[PDB]
Amino acid sequence: EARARLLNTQGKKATRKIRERMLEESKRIAELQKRRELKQAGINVAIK
Amino acid sequence: PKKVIRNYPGHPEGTTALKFLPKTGHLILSGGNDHTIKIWDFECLRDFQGHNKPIKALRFTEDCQSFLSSSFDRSVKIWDTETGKVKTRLHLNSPADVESRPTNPHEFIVGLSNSKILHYDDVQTYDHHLSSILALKYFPDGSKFISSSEDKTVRIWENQVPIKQISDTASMPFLNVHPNYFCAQSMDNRIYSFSKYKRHPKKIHSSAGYGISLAFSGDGRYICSGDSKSRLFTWDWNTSRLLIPGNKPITQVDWHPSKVICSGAAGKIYVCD
Amino acid sequence: RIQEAIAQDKTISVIIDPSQIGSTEGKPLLSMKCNLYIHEILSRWKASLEAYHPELFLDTKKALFPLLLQLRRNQLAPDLLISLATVLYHLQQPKEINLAVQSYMKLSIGNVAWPIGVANIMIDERTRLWITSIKRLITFEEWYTSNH
Amino acid sequence: KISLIQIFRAHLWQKIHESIVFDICQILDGELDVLQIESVTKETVHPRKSYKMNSSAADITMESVHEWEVSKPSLLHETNDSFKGLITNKMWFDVQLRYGDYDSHDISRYVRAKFLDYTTDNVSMYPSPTGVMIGIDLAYNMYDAYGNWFNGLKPLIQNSMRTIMKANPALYVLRERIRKGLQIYQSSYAELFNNDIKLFVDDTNVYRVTVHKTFEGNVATKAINGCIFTLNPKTGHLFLKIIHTSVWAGQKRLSQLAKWKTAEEVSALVRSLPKEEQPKQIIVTRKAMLDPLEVHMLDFPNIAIRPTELRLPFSAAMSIDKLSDVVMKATEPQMVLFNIYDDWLDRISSYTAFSRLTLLLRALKTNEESAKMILLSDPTITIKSYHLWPSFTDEQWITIESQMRDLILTEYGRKYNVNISALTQTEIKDIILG
RNA sequence: GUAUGUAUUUAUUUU
RNA sequence: UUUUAAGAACUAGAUACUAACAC
RNA sequence: UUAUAGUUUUUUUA
C-alpha cells in the first residue's frame, strides 16, 4: 500500500490532465486513419 | 447497387479468411482450408505455408510490416513481410479463431475455443464468455476489445473485466467496426448495431464500407447489402455456385482501403464492384 | 358517399382477417367490419341480458354509439382503427382472450396494438369513453364462451 | 416557503377544491324532492378559480322545482329569516378557499365581506342575484355560508359540513401532510380472496440501478428497463407496465421520480378500466408508495388503499424468466397481460396455489439458483409459452413444494445462527407466511 | 444533492 | 545488421477503492 | 427523510 503510495506525486488534477491529453491523442490517431482510409478510396476530406 | 466484377479460383480447399494490405491496397492475404496462404494481387504473388491445419484468421498490421496468422493448430504465428519467414510463435490456446491487432499499442488480441481473450505482448487474460469466442476487435479508446461468443452475448472489455454486456442477441458469429465509433454485430436472423437492421431469415461475416454501406454474407449464398444509417436493405444478391448447392456461401469478406472481396466456400474468391 | 354504400352491403361478415389490419386500401372495409362485429356482440349480450350484468348493458351501448357511427363512416384515424381491430381480432379467437386484453392495455395506454398471434396514439374524452366500454365487450365474451 | 412548497403539490390545492365541493356536487346533486329541486346546474369551472383570488363568480346554480323565497342575506348560522322578500328559481353557491393567518382567523368578516362586495360588484358573474357563500380557511379548518335564504337547507349544510370537513379525503391529505412537516402524531389475512377485486402492486423492479465503469475511476450508477408488476391473486391476468429507460432521461434522482411514475401508471390503468373491472383495494409491500399512490388516489374515494400488516417476499419477480425476457425486449413502453398460475385453477383452488406460489418466491429469494435448477432440473417436460414455472405432474408440484419449503428452514437454521430443531410451530408458520 | 468542461457538418468548391 | 518471452492448463478467494443503492 | 445537501465553526443535559 505505502510502497505504491509514495510513487505518485501529483494529485487528482494532474492525473486528470494526463488522461485528457492522451484521449486527445487517440482522437487524433482515429481522425487520421479516418483520413488515411478515405485516401485509400481517393476521396480527400479536409481536416477541421 | 453492386455487381460481380471478377472470379478468382485457385485455392484447393475452402477460403476461411481474407485481409487486405492496409497501406497500398496492392494485395490480399487469404487463408484457406488447405493450411496455405495465397497472396493475391488486387494474379497470385506468393504462397505462405507453415500451418499444419486450417487457417481460421489472418490480420495484417498497420505500423508494422508484420502479418499475424492464426489457425486451428493452437498457435498464433507472426510473419515478417520483408523476408517472408515465421518470426515468432505465441501460445496459450490448446484452436484460436480470431486475431485482431490493437492499433496503437503493439499488442495482439487472440481468441478461440479457449473461451478467453489473450492480450499478447507483441500479458493479459480476460475471463469472460461462457462459450467459444468467434470474433474479436480492437479500439483505441475505451473499450479496447469487443468480443462475441456462442453464448449469444457481446462484451465490451476494459483491459487495464467487462465494462459492458450486450445480451440482445438470441451465437454472434461476426462483428465489424465502422471505420462513427460503433460496431455492427451479427446473429442468425438479426443484424444489430451497437454504439437495428431489417432482416427476414438470412440465417446464417459483415464488412463496413467507408460510405456507410453494411455488407452481410449469407450461408444461403445471398449477399445482403444494407445502408448503415437506416437499417434499410437496398439489395440482395445470389452468387452462382460453380461448375453443390450446399457449397454456396460466403465465408469472409472485406473492402479495400469501392471494391468488395469475398472468399466463398466453393473454393473461389470473388470481387464485387 | 362510399361509406353510405359499404354500410348497406350484406356481403361483409363480422370475421376479421388480421392481414388486413394495417392495410391502407382496406381501411374502409375493416372499419365497417369492426362496426358489424361490435353490434353482433351487443346482440348476443342482449339475447342473454338477464344472465350477464344486465345493469351495465345500457351504459355500454350509449358509450359505444359514437364509436359505431364513426366506424360506419370511416372516421377513425389509422392508428386507432389498427389498435381496435387488433383487440377485436384476438377476441374472435377463444384461446386468445389474453392477447386481446394485452392489446386492450396498449390501446388504453395510447400505444398502437398490432396482432400478436400473427408506435403511439392520442386519446380524447369521448374517445376514452368508448375505449372503456370495449373492456366490457371482452368480459362479456369470456363469460359467453365459458357459459354454454 | 420550503415547507409549504412541500405541503401543496400536483395542485393539491385545486384537488382540494374539487374533492370538497364537487363531492357536494354529489350530495346535493341528488336531494331533489324535499327542497323542491328541478336539477343541479353548475357552470363549468375554469381551472384557475381555485388558486386565483382576484375575483370570484357564482359556482353551482340551484334551479328550483317551482319557486323560492329569498330573505335578506344571512349566515348559515345566522338564524331567523323571513324568506318572502323575493323569489327565484336559479341560484348558486360561492364556495372558496383561503389559508388564513393569525390576523384574520375569523372568516365571517371575510365571508360577508367578500360575499357582499362580490354580489354588489360588476365583475362578479351571476345567473341569479341571490345565492350562498361557503368559504374555508384550511388554516384553522373553518368554513361558513352567508347566503340569501329560502328555507330547509340550513341543517343539510350544517351536518353535511360536519361530514365533509371530517371526510372528503383531500382534507385528510393535508392533515396527514401537515403532520408530516410538523412531526406530530399523537403517542399513546385470508380475506385477500374475498369477491371484490384485490390487486398486487410491487415496485422493487421498477428502477434497476446498474453499476458501470467510471471514465477515470469511481463507481458509476445507471439503470436498465423495469416494469410495474401488478396482479390480482385470484383470476391471474398480469398487468405489466413496461418501464423503458428512455423514461428517466434527463431529470433528478429517480427515487422520487420512480415512486411517482409508479403511482401515475397504476392510477391511469385504474381510471381507464371499467367500473366493473376496477379494484376495490390495492395491496403493496413497499410503503414508500403510499404518498404517490394516495395523492393520485384522491380522485376515487370509492377505492380504498390498504397496506401490509405482515412480512412479505415479493422482490423475486424478475428472476423467473419469461416475463423478464419480455422486460428486456421492449423497444417502447407498453402494457402486457399474462398468466400467473400456469393453470392452477383446474387442479386446485387459487388458495393453496397461492401458498405454493409464495413458497416458490421464497426459495427464489434465499438461495436462488439451487431453486432454479430444482425447477428446470429435468426440462424434458417443457414449459409452454403461456406457462412460466416448469410444468409438472401432481407429485412434482407437491414434493417441490416440500423442497423449496425446506430451503429457508435449513439455510435458515444454518445461516441465521439459531437452530431449526428447537423451533416452535408459530415461528415456522411465520417465516412460511412471511 | 451539484457547479464545470467537451463534440454535436445538413445542403458534393473544378485536376 | 538488431530481438527474444520459460511456455500451457487448472483454482479459490483476502485485502482493496469507490455506490446521486438498501436502515 | 422529504421540495435537497460547501460552506452558513459539524455536533452536549438540567
Side-chain angles (χ1 to χ4, degrees), chain A, chain B residues 1 3-4 6 9-12 14-17 22 24-25 30-34 36 38 40-41 44 50-51 54 57 61 64 66 69-71 73 75-77 79-84 86 88 94-96 100 102-103 105 110-111 113 115 117 121 123 125 129 132-133 135 140 142-143 147-149 151 153-155 157 162 164 167 169-171 173 177-179 183-184 191 193 201 204 206-209 211 213-215 218-220 224-230 234 239-240 245-246 249 251 253 257-258 261-262 264-267 269 271-272, chain C, chain D:
Chain A
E1 181 179 2
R3 185 174 179 81
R5 175 182 294 180
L6 301 179
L7 298 175
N8 294 285
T9 64
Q10 292 177 336
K12 291 188 294 185
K13 174 55 180 170
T15 63
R16 184 172 181 274
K17 293 301 289 185
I18 287 173
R19 293 187 60 81
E20 296 169 352
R21 188 169 298 107
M22 292 298 178
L23 294 176
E24 180 181 2
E25 296 306 319
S26 66
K27 291 178 178 178
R28 294 179 62 250
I29 298 169
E31 184 66 14
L32 297 185
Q33 293 183 339
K34 300 285 187 66
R35 183 175 184 271
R36 296 182 183 177
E37 298 305 322
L38 287 174
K39 180 177 291 296
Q40 298 304 321
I43 289 95
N44 292 282
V45 176
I47 301 302
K48 272 70 179 180
Chain B
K3 64 179 180 180
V4 183
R6 183 182 301 171
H11 271 283
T15 168
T16 299
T24 284
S30 300
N33 201 32
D34 68 11
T36 60
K38 292 183 178 297
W40 297 96
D41 182 2
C44 168
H51 289 291
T61 177
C64 307
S66 292
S69 67
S70 70
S71 176
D73 63 10
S75 57
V76 180
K77 288 184 179 295
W79 286 87
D80 182 2
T81 292
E82 295 176 353
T83 297
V86 293
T88 305
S94 207
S100 178
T103 336
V110 59
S113 302
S115 300
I117 297 171
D121 186 2
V123 173
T125 296
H129 314 290
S132 331
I133 294 168
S143 335
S147 62
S148 59
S149 61
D151 64 354
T153 65
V154 173
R155 283 180 168 81
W157 289 96
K164 179 64 173 174
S167 59
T169 291
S171 175
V177 293
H178 186 278
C183 68
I191 296 171
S193 174
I204 301 169
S206 303
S207 298
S213 174
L214 174 60
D219 280 343
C224 177
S225 294
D227 172 68
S228 177
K229 298 285 183 290
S230 67
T234 70
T239 62
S240 182
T251 296
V253 68
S258 297
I261 299 102
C262 61
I269 297 169
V271 292
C272 297
Chain C
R1 272 145 59 68
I2 9 69
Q3 275 70 60
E4 182 185 3
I6 55 178
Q8 300 180 182
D9 173 34
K10 287 64 183 60
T11 304
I12 305 173
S13 80
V14 303
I15 306 170
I16 295 171
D17 175 348
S19 64
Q20 288 294 106
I21 285 182
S23 176
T24 76
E25 176 182 6
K27 182 157 180 298
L29 178 59
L30 175 63
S31 184
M32 191 63 233
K33 280 183 162 294
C34 286
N35 166 288
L36 294 174
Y37 177 44
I38 291 172
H39 275 294
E40 192 276 333
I41 303 173
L42 291 170
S43 180
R44 283 183 286 111
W45 184 344
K46 220 307 176 188
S48 52
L49 192 46
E50 69 192 60
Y52 185 77
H53 294 285
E55 18 74 22
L56 291 171
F57 191 57
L58 180 55
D59 276 349
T60 304
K61 291 167 60 182
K62 290 180 174 180
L64 295 176
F65 178 71
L67 170 61
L68 290 168
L69 183 60
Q70 289 187 293
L71 289 174
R72 204 166 306 175
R73 295 172 172 169
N74 190 36
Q75 305 177 313
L76 273 197
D79 286 359
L80 213 45
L81 174 59
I82 281 171
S83 306
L84 174 61
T86 294
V87 171
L88 282 45
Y89 162 68
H90 281 124
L91 192 60
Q92 292 188 170
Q93 269 51 63
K95 293 185 177 184
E96 296 188 4
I97 189 65
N98 283 287
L99 304 183
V101 172
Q102 277 168 40
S103 306
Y104 174 72
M105 234 58 264
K106 298 176 186 174
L107 170 61
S108 69
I109 262 59
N111 295 336
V112 188
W114 290 97
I116 297 174
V118 184
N120 307 63
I121 319 172
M122 294 184 268
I123 307 178
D124 175 55
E125 181 51 58
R126 185 178 294 80
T127 295
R128 193 79 63 172
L129 192 60
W130 66 252
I131 287 184
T132 296
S133 285
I134 294 302
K135 210 148 200 257
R136 302 176 183 179
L137 296 186
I138 299 170
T139 71
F140 167 71
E141 189 58 18
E142 177 175 15
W143 174 86
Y144 187 83
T145 56
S146 293
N147 294 61
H148 264 63
Chain D
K1 178 172 175 283
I2 296 174
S3 67
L4 294 186
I5 290 167
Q6 291 178 340
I7 281 179
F8 298 161
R9 59 187 176 280
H11 309 292
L12 172 59
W13 192 263
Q14 297 175 334
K15 287 178 175 179
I16 295 161
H17 195 197
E18 296 183 355
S19 176
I20 284 101
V21 185
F22 173 77
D23 282 350
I24 285 182
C25 179
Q26 295 188 343
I27 292 173
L28 286 176
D29 184 69
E31 280 298 329
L32 299 170
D33 296 341
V34 179
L35 286 176
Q36 297 173 332
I37 299 168
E38 278 295 323
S39 63
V40 172
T41 62
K42 63 179 178 293
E43 299 163 345
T44 59
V45 175
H46 183 277
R48 305 182 196 177
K49 180 168 175 284
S50 297
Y51 65 100
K52 185 189 87 179
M53 282 308 299
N54 294 346
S55 70
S56 62
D59 284 346
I60 296 171
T61 65
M62 289 305 299
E63 177 176 359
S64 63
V65 160
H66 197 54
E67 291 176 353
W68 274 334
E69 308 172 356
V70 166
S71 60
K72 284 185 176 179
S74 64
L75 287 171
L76 165 61
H77 304 300
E78 286 169 347
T79 68
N80 294 334
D81 300 340
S82 72
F83 306 86
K84 299 177 179 71
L86 292 176
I87 299 168
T88 56
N89 286 343
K90 295 172 181 175
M91 283 294 293
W92 45 259
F93 281 155
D94 283 343
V95 175
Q96 283 188 337
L97 292 178
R98 58 176 287 273
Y99 180 73
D101 280 330
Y102 174 82
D103 283 347
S104 65
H105 64 294
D106 284 344
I107 310 175
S108 68
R109 295 174 64 241
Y110 173 90
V111 178
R112 73 171 63 188
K114 308 304 284 187
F115 174 83
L116 298 178
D117 166 63
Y118 292 147
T119 52
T120 59
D121 183 3
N122 297 338
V123 172
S124 63
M125 291 282 293
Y126 299 106
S128 66
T130 62
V132 171
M133 167 78 90
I134 296 172
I136 283 169
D137 291 349
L138 310 173
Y140 299 91
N141 62 37
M142 300 313 297
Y143 63 96
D144 273 333
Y146 187 85
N148 286 329
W149 294 98
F150 57 87
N151 196 339
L153 283 162
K154 299 175 183 177
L156 305 174
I157 291 172
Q158 302 168 340
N159 297 331
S160 61
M161 306 301 284
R162 290 182 178 173
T163 60
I164 302 159
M165 309 307 292
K166 291 173 180 174
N168 279 331
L171 300 183
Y172 191 68
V173 169
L174 293 189
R175 292 183 176 85
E176 290 183 353
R177 181 166 302 189
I178 277 170
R179 296 179 190 171
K180 302 290 189 178
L182 288 175
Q183 300 178 344
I184 272 181
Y185 305 90
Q186 181 174 0
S187 64
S188 62
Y189 173 81
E191 298 302 323
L192 306 173
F193 304 100
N194 288 334
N195 52 339
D196 59 349
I197 306 99
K198 305 188 180 75
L199 270 66
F200 281 102
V201 181
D202 191 65
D203 283 344
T204 57
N205 296 334
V206 164
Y207 160 72
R208 278 183 292 181
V209 176
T210 62
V211 173
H212 303 297
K213 291 180 180 294
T214 55
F215 222 126
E216 294 171 346
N218 280 339
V219 178
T221 66
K222 274 187 62 63
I224 301 169
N225 287 339
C227 59
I228 296 173
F229 182 81
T230 58
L231 60 81
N232 62 337
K234 294 180 177 179
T235 59
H237 290 162
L238 282 170
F239 299 90
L240 287 174
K241 164 54 173 60
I242 289 174
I243 294 168
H244 184 274
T245 53
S246 65
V247 162
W248 302 102
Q251 66 290 4
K252 297 303 286 186
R253 53 177 63 88
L254 296 69
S255 67
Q256 170 220 66
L257 189 59
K259 303 174 181 176
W260 284 83
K261 297 193 80 68
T262 56
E264 286 184 355
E265 287 303 322
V266 168
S267 64
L269 179 63
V270 173
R271 284 182 172 175
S272 61
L273 290 179
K275 302 172 180 179
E276 262 301 316
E277 285 182 343
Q278 294 165 335
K280 297 300 287 186
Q281 288 184 336
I282 292 172
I283 291 173
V284 181
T285 62
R286 179 185 288 186
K287 288 183 63 63
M289 288 297 296
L290 285 176
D291 279 340
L293 293 175
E294 299 169 352
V295 179
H296 279 284
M297 298 316 297
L298 283 178
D299 309 351
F300 295 138
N302 291 338
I303 297 172
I305 292 170
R306 293 174 177 172
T308 61
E309 304 305 321
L310 314 168
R311 47 186 62 92
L312 293 176
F314 284 91
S315 63
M318 291 294 292
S319 63
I320 306 159
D321 280 343
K322 296 291 177 61
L323 300 176
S324 62
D325 288 339
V326 174
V327 177
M328 302 299 187
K329 289 174 180 174
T331 54
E332 298 177 355
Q334 63 192 26
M335 281 302 303
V336 188
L337 273 111
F338 286 98
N339 182 24
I340 307 158
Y341 289 132
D342 294 342
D343 295 346
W344 291 356
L345 296 181
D346 285 346
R347 291 189 179 179
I348 319 168
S349 63
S350 66
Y351 185 84
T352 49
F354 189 77
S355 68
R356 72 168 62 184
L357 186 66
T358 65
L359 300 175
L360 288 171
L361 296 179
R362 300 184 178 284
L364 292 164
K365 174 182 290 184
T366 61
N367 293 282
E368 281 194 350
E369 305 174 357
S370 69
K372 189 181 296 176
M373 295 305 294
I374 293 175
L375 299 181
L376 295 173
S377 65
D378 278 349
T380 60
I381 286 174
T382 59
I383 312 164
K384 293 189 293 292
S385 62
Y386 294 141
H387 303 292
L388 296 179
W389 307 92
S391 65
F392 298 120
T393 61
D394 288 341
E395 303 167 354
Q396 297 185 343
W397 294 104
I398 294 165
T399 55
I400 290 170
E401 294 181 348
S402 64
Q403 306 172 338
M404 305 288 284
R405 179 177 293 105
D406 296 336
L407 291 177
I408 302 178
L409 301 174
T410 57
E411 168 191 358
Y412 181 82
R414 179 197 292 179
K415 178 173 169 285
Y416 299 79
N417 199 339
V418 171
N419 189 342
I420 187 173
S421 63
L423 297 177
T424 304
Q425 176 63 56
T426 61
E427 292 184 355
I428 288 107
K429 68 167 285 185
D430 189 353
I431 296 174
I432 289 174
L433 304 182

